Design a protein around this ligand. Structure first.
Ligand SMILES: CCCCCCCCCCCCCCCCCCCC(=O)O[C@H](COC(=O)CCCCCCCCCCCCCC)COP(=O)(O)OCCN
Ligand SMILES: *[C@@H]1O[C@H](CO)[C@@H](O)[C@H](O)[C@H]1NC(C)=O
Ligand SMILES: *[C@@H]1O[C@H](CO)[C@@H](O)[C@H](O)[C@H]1NC(C)=O
Ligand SMILES: *[C@H]1O[C@H](CO)[C@@H](O)[C@H](O)[C@H]1NC(C)=O
Ligand SMILES: [Ca+2]
Ligand SMILES: [Ca+2]
Ligand SMILES: [Ca+2]
Ligand SMILES: [Ca+2]
Ligand SMILES: [Ca+2]
Ligand SMILES: [Ca+2]
Ligand SMILES: [Ca+2]
Lengths: 172, 33
């Protein structure tokens, strides 16, 4: 059967400094988690006790750090290249484990204002444009994402290692 | 030079161009001319 963990995050930016997050995650077709709130107080919940208290607290901590870094990157693109506000960003990501036993397929696609923007390529851990409209914003965003261990290798590891282990443990 | 989210820090001749190698845009961010 095709075992998978999907994660969705919508970020509504009224301006550079304020964001409302809304997201969720699912194992197969089953909703498992919800995320919602302003950047200052984002509630992250597992609908079922999949992880024990300590392990859940560690996951929540990593997700909160990610949210602050995501917001930081959007603020940086604005400071460096100017973004037109309000804007909405959608991140859709996950890991899918083939029944046969081949390597897990992963993805991380970013859309802005409902249109394809950039997406992650796991083979060499690089980001590419999904839009054909060239702009200083797209060029700069890709330069930043492709410049650091954090946004390349650590991100690939979250998808191929953390996400995959989570699917193997909580679905079985 | 740039490291993850370092660019949210205020520009600095010392941190960016003396302690590290800076590219032209990093230098311009310091000059503000
Ligand atoms: C798998 C465990 C699952 C546990 C249960 C799931 C919990 C679900 C509850 C929440 C609902 C899901 C919605 C949120 C999904 C968040 C994704 C988290 C990914 C994450 O933490 O990434 C880290 C890197 O972050 C970074 O690199 C930060 C920035 C990333 C780039 C984002 C791209 C957007 C581009 C915006 C640019 C601006 C454009 C301007 C218009 C690496 O993961 P790790 O820290 O765990 O380390 C692993 C290595 N060891
Ligand atoms: C999951 O998050 C997405 C974000 O686009 C939202 O549209 C969808 O309705 C959410 N699902 C639930 C069950 O809330
Ligand atoms: C996104 O859409 C809003 C509302 O329509 C618009 O004001 C803003 O300029 C757009 N921002 C983009 C495309 O970055
Ligand atoms: C990536 O981050 C820095 C490079 O500036 C370095 O300290 C680290 O060793 C690099 N990662 C690996 C696994 O080598
Ligand atoms: Ca600049
Ligand atoms: Ca630096
Ligand atoms: Ca710099
Ligand atoms: Ca700088
Ligand atoms: Ca010094
Ligand atoms: Ca330095
Ligand atoms: Ca800069």
């Amino acid at each position: 059967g095709l075992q998978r963990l999907h994660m969705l995050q919508i970020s509504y930016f009224r301006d550079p400094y304020h964001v409302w997050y809304q997201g969720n995650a699912s194992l197969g077709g089953h909703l498992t988690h919800v995320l919602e709130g302003p950047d200052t107080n984002t509630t992250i919940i597992q609908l079922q006790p999949l992880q024990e208290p300590e392990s859940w607290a560690r996951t929540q901590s990593g997700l909160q750090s990610y949210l602050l870094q995501f917001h930081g990157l959007v603020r940086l693109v604005h400071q460096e290249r100017t973004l037109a506000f309000p804007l909405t960003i959608r991140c859709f990501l996950g890991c899918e484990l083939p029944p046969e036993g081949s390597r897990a397929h992963v993805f991380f696609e970013v859309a802005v204002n409902g249109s394809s923007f950039v997406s992650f390529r796991p083979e060499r851990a690089l980001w590419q444009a999904d839009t054909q409209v060239t702009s200083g914003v797209v060029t700069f965003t890709l330069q930043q994402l492709n410049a650091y261990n954090r946004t390349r290798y650590e991100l690939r590891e979250f998808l191929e290692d953390t996400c995959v282990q989570y699917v193997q443990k909580h679905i079985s | 030079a740039n490291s993850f989210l370092e660019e949210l820090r205020h520009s600095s001749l010392e941190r960016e161009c003396i302690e590290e190698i800076c590219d032209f845009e990093e230098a311009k961010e310091i000059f503000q001319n």
